[PDB]
Amino acid sequence: DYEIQRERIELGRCIGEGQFGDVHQGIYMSPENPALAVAIKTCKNCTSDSVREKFLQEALTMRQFDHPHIVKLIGVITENPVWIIMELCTLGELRSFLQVRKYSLDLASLILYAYQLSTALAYLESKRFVHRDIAARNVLVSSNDCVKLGDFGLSRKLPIKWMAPESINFRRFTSASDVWMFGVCMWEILMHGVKPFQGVKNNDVIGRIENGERLPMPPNCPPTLYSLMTKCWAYDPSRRPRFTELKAQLSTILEEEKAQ
Numbered sequence: 006d007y008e009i010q011r012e013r014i015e016l017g018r019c020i021g022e023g024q025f026g027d028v029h030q031g032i033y034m035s036p037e038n039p040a041l042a043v044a045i046k047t048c049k050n051c052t053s054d055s056v057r058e059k060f061l062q063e064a065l066t067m068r069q070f071d072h073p074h075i076v077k078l079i080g081v082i083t084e085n086p087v088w089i090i091m092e093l094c095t096l097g098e099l100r101s102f103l104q105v106r107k108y109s110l111d112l113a114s115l116i117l118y119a120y121q122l123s124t125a126l127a128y129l130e131s132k133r134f135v136h137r138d139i140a141a142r143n144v145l146v147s148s149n150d151c152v153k154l155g156d157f158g159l160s161r162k163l164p165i166k167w168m169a170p171e172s173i174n175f176r177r178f179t180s181a182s183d184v185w186m187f188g189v190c191m192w193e194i195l196m197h198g199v200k201p202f203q204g205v206k207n208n209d210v211i212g213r214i215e216n217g218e219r220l221p222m223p224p225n226c227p228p229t230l231y232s233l234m235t236k237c238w239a240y241d242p243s244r245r246p247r248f249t250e251l252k253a254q255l256s257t258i259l260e261e262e263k264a265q
């Protein structure tokens with residue numbers, strides 16, 4: 006079931022570049038089922054068994070997950086050319102989607118994306134996985150009302166601007182450090198896909214965080230949501246909320262916005 010027959014894949018257009026090679030969209034002709042839209046990850050140098058093992062590492066990890074807000078692994082093809090087949094999020098990368106729609110996406114949609122991501126991250130935690138790379142660039146858009154976490158490369162250069170202090174200083178990665186990163190991801194969503202700490206050197210960010218400085222309140226962000234983000238950024242990991250508490254509080258914030 007993990008191994009897929011290449012004859013059941015129809016390769017389509019290139020939709021981006023990955024670490025190991027181009028990614029294309031295509032179709033998976035599932036046995037006795039409707040054809041699924043898929044993302045096919047290619048690997049340029051996978052003729053090397055050493056490169057193949059590194060490329061396939063992420064697919065081995067994805068096989069154990071099953072959640073509505075996490076991209077699904079369909080299968081892999083281990084003969085040359087080696088391919089990784091994922092469920093396709095039709096609308097693409099969340100940052101680009103937010104940047105284009107800055108003056109048209111309503112606030113309830115932005116809060117909904119944060120809520121959905123909190124459910125995927127509570128699920129990740131429940132499986133003893135620590136993501137270590139929560140950022141809007143790793144979120145994909147399945148539809149206008151559905152986002153999914155799509156990159157597990159660092160799961161179970163360093164993204165310093167998203168990292169908790171204990172991860173930068175001591176290489177500690179826990180579900181509480183993922184909560185810090187999720188706070189930064191929520192800020193990126195509320196900022197319509199703007200990167201945190203733009204124009205600031207990585208070492209200047211470290212000194213700013215240690216000194217108590219934090220990302221500012223996004224314009225039009227509900228105060229309760231910004232307070233929630235600042236709690237994700239408590240220096241002491243014990244003072245951060247848990248993903249289950251984030252999910253409950255995001256649901257309340259979403260319903261308060263929907264009731265206008």
Ligand SMILES: O=C1Cc2cc(Nc3ncc(C(F)(F)F)c(NCc4cccnc4)n3)ccc2N1
Nearest residue numbers: 020021028044076091093094095096097098155
């Ligand atoms: O014109 C388009 C339409 C379109 C759809 C998608 N969807 C999509 N869904 C799932 C995945 C995967 F990770 F699960 F494999 C994926 N990976 C390629 C990718 C990821 C991040 C950033 N760039 C590319 N991409 C992406 C880009 C684009 N570009």
